[PDB]
């Protein structure tokens, strides 16, 4: 794909916000694409990183990995620029072998996307209650 | 929540496939809740596991964790019952602190579910292309 801007709509609990994301290039050390929030200052922006890793002599299967972090800005007294109080993290890693087909990988992707809107994962992720 | 049958729709590239997942109990020794498909042979089942871990004297973070395992099976030359050829995995970890509000957690969840349906990630996961 091409690193373009990404608009994420119908986001949040009410489902009425947007998160717009500007591409921040790839990293020649790791091979990781980066995307940040529109606006910003550095160290107070919402970050999305994504990498894809091929087979090698060490690991035999492909590995896709998404990693999103986002801070909370608190304005203390006596200072003009905010500090970060909390980070929230999520990181998905997909593992697919070399004889896997496009249909199977799309099935995993869309299964996870459909599953995160189910009441078990609502009540697990944003209420922190386990299943019983 | 309580474990009941989760049925997921609009799965696949076409978005015309469903999947039902029946409850398979909670494991008391780690707190992992399980959902599986409706087969007789246990090695051929697509399964989902989900847990959430409280803070302790070591981690100091709430940790939500979802896993997806899809086998693909086929019967070989001179073989009668099908054996499992491939495994497609998925492993999501959410990490939060004690002072995070629920709207932050819902934002991270909906942000992930909206990233999984964006052309950058459906090109990186389906066709195995790093973002370039």
């Amino acid at each position: 794909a091409k690193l373009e801007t990404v608009t994420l709509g119908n986001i949040g609990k009410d489902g009425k916000q947007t998160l717009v994301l500007n591409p921040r290039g790839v990293n020649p050390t790791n091979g990781v694409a980066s995307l940040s929030q529109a606006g910003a200052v550095p160290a107070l922006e919402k970050r999305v990183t994504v990498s894809v890793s091929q087979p090698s002599r060490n690991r035999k299967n492909y590995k896709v990995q998404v990693k999103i972090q986002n801070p909370t800005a608190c304005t203390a007294n006596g200072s003009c620029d905010p500090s970060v109080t909390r980070q929230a993290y999520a990181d998905v890693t997909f593992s697919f072998t070399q004889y896997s087909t496009d249909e199977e990988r799309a099935f995993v992707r869309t299964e996870l996307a459909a599953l995160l809107a189910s009441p078990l994962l609502i009540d697990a992720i944003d209420q922190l209650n386990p299943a019983y | 929540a309580k474990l009941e049958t989760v049925t997921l729709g609009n799965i696949g590239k076409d978005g015309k496939q469903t999947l039902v997942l029946n409850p398979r109990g909670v494991n008391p020794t780690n707190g992992v809740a399980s959902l599986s498909q409706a087969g007789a042979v246990p090695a051929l089942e697509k399964r989902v596991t989900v847990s959430v871990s409280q803070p302790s004297r070591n981690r100091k973070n709430y940790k939500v964790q979802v896993k997806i395992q899809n086998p693909t099976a086929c019967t070989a030359n001179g073989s009668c019952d099908p054996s499992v050829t491939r495994q497609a995995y998925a492993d999501v970890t959410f990490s939060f602190t004690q002072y995070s509000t629920d709207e932050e957690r819902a934002f991270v969840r909906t942000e992930l579910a909206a990233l999984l349906a964006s052309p950058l990630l459906i090109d990186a996961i389906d066709q195995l292309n790093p973002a370039y």
Partner: nanobody
Amino acid sequence: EVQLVESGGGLVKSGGSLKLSCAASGFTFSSYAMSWVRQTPEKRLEWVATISDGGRYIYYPDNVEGRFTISRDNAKNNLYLQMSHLKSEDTAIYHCARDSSGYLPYFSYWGQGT
């Protein structure tokens, strides 16, 4: 114990309006999809409306869509149906229902009232 009680009720004339309500204790209300299912005096069931977890995706049939409106209050744990224009077929029981953990609803828990 999934409990669902209704209020509003009513005896109206034609072309009026009314607002049915639902109280919804026993479970985590804000996780589940909720729904309205009415029952005619000739004992036929009819789906009325569904809403999503946060109130974003709302479904109506064609007989309903221009003149009914549903909403949630996840802090007060209340479900709301705003009935309007009341064209004399709307003389039913109007149960609350909790949807299944799914994609399109099959009602598992029901509320008797109105």
